[PDB]
Amino acid sequence: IHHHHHHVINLKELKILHTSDWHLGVTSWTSSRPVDRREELKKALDKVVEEAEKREVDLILLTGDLLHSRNNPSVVALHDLLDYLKRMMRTAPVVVLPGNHDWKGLKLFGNFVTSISSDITFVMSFEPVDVEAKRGQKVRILPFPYPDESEALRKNEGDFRFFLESRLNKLYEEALKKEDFAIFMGHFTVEGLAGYAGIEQGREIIINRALIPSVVDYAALGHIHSFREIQKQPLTIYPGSLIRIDFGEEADEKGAVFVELKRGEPPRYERIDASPLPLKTLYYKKIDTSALKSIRDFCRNFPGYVRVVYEEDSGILPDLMGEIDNLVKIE
Ligand SMILES: N=C1NC(=O)/C(=C\c2ccc(O)cc2)S1
Numbered sequence: 001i002h003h004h005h006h007h008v009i010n011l012k013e014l015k016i017l018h019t020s021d022w023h024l025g026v027t028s029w030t031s032s033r034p035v036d037r038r039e040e041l042k043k044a045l046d047k048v049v050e051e052a053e054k055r056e057v058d059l060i061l062l063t064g065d066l067l068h069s070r071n072n073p074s075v076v077a078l079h080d081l082l083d084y085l086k087r088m089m090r091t092a093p094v095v096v097l098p099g100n101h102d103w104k105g106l107k108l109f110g111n112f113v114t115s116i117s118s119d120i121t122f123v124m125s126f127e128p129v130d131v132e133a134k135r136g137q138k139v140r141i142l143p144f145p146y147p148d149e150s151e152a153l154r155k156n157e158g159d160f161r162f163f164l165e166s167r168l169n170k171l172y173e174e175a176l177k178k179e180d181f182a183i184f185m186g187h188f189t190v191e192g193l194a195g196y197a198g199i200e201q202g203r204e205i206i207i208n209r210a211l212i213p214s215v216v217d218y219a220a221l222g223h224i225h226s227f228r229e230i231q232k233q234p235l236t237i238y239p240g241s242l243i244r245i246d247f248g249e250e251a252d253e254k255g256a257v258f259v260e261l262k263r264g265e266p267p268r269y270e271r272i273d274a275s276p277l278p279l280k281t282l283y284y285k286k287i288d289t290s291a292l293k294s295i296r297d298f299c300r301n302f303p304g305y306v307r308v309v310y311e312e313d314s315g316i317l318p319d320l321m322g323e324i325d326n327l328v329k330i331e
């Protein structure tokens with residue numbers, strides 16, 4: 001046949017796959033028992049990609065931290081990224097909103113790649129971009145990346161906040177000039193999140209959810225590891241990551257989201273579960289004979305990774321990480 005976009009008259013529906021926060025390249029628990037997450041992660045992504053193909057989505061949105069390493073991603077990590085980007089592009093046009101990147105290689109790459117292809121678009125600034133979806137639908141993208149110099153501008157909280165708000169107002173106005181659909185994409189922490197917020201060791205951008213341009217058909221967010229449905233109008237969602245990165249994500253649901261839009265109807269979505277490996281934390285006062293029994297018994301047939309937390313030493317610990325290959329941390 002052909003392998004370009006279709007052009008359907010008066011089509012007022014849009015099918016979206018939104019995934020985020022891949023963290024390609026991650027090795028977890030390096031201080032206790034390093035575990036390369038690559039194999040588990042690629043399984044999840046395959047599942048997401050296969051779902052996309054089955055649902056014949058029209059557009060694929062990628063937000064958040066696709067690479068784990070801020071400034072120095074490994075070659076393997078890069079190769080997996082570009083590999084998965086190609087696979088999606090074979091399914092549907094892809095729009096990518098990069099996370100908090102350091103290396104300048106990305107911006108030149110993203111622009112060049114966007115200039116030469118009609119199936120991937122990198123949105124690296126605050127400028128809106130119109131894109132064409134799989135069946136010819138015109139989609140206006142309103143991007144909200146991490147601001148480059150303003151976080152380091154050291155401008156007071158007041159002026160910085162006003163900068164952000166004025167940026168959102170601009171996006172609001174640009175969304176009103178929409179042909180067909182408009183989608184917001186952002187990479188920041190929604191104000192008053194509980195409890196994926198209050199994360200440390202990273203410079204944070206807090207945005208009140210009311211300030212997300214209310215006239216968009218969908219608000220695709222990334223940066224947060226847990227799936228959250230922030231609000232219904234405009235439908236605003238963090239997909240979450242695809243694997244449980246660390247033990248604070250034990251109780252999380254991981255996957256991507258499928259979203260359907262129809263002009264005269266309200267937006268509907270289904271979660272696509274990545275069904276990643278489970279995590280479990282076991283708690284004890286001391287590692288006594290009872291605790292050893294409990295640990296050994298639990299880990300025995302548990303398919304995922306296990307952390308043990310305890311308060312006090314009480315003699316020489318047996319080589320538990322030896323007998324139990326599942327146990328990745330005893331602090
Ligand atoms: N600290 C960082 N987090 C990221 O996601 C980084 C880079 C990135 C580059 C391309 C892309 O599509 C997503 C993220 S750097």
Ligand SMILES: [Mn+2]
Pocket residue numbers: 064065099100187222223224
């Ligand atoms: Mn982030």
Ligand SMILES: [Mn+2]
Pocket residue numbers: 021064065223224225
């Ligand atoms: Mn993240």
